[PDB]
Amino acid sequence: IPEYVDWRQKGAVTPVKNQGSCGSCWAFSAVVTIEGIIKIRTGNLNEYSEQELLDCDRRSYGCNGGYPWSALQLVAQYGIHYRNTYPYEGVQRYCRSREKGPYAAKTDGVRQVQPYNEGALLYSIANQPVSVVLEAAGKDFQLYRGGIFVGPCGNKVDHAVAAVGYGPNYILIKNSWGTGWGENGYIRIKRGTGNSYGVCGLYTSSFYPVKN
Ligand SMILES: *[C@@H](C(=O)O)[C@H](O)C(=O)N[C@H](C(=O)NCCCCCCCCN)C1CCC1
After folding, report:
1. What class, spelled out in words, does domain 1-212 have in CATH?
2. Ligand 1: nearest atom to the Cα of 26
3. Helix 25-42 and helix 68-77, axial crossing angle in degrees, nearest 10
4. Annotated catalytic, 159?
5. Which effect does the record note for changing residue 36 to S?
């Protein structure tokens, strides 16, 4: 695999979003991976609906949190609508998929990266954007403005994001806190430290969609 990956340069990443106060990071994280795999497989970059996952993933808990895996399983077992058809409201409502016509995209499965394994995560990122989790509660992460982030941070993961690239010393993360946070919405998190958890627990739980 190459020394640098940046899915933005391949036209596989949509603009940075802001989840607001709702605990919907799990849905935002999943959607980034769907937008990516559909571009990689079909050549078209579209925005898909975080709100639909928020409303319809019965294994998750709406704005009280949820699971990227379950959201990705939903897209594989049913599908997902375009964001324009099912726009983001920042609050959980009833599932409205059947009212909104046929699904726009559908995947074929979900896979988990072997946890606590930097190289396995880099391999997956080289193939497509990946849903990852980290500890975002610390003030250092909250206040991040730029550079390769080394912490301080623990490994008590609490926030799902998406890995969209890497380089020799970092993994490139698309966050869902708007374009005014970090590097225009992104953070580069240090890698190669030899801590199996990853910086901020980044290697704890990583999933990606499969599409034939
Ligand atoms: C992430 C965010 O910042 O929006 C969000 O808090 C999240 O989904 N976190 C997530 C998580 O904690 N998932 C489980 C939620 C369980 C709620 C239980 C409610 C019922 C209690 N009786 C994980 C993935 C990131 C860490």
Report:
1. alpha beta
2. 8
3. 40
4. yes
5. Enhanced thermostability and higher optimum temperature
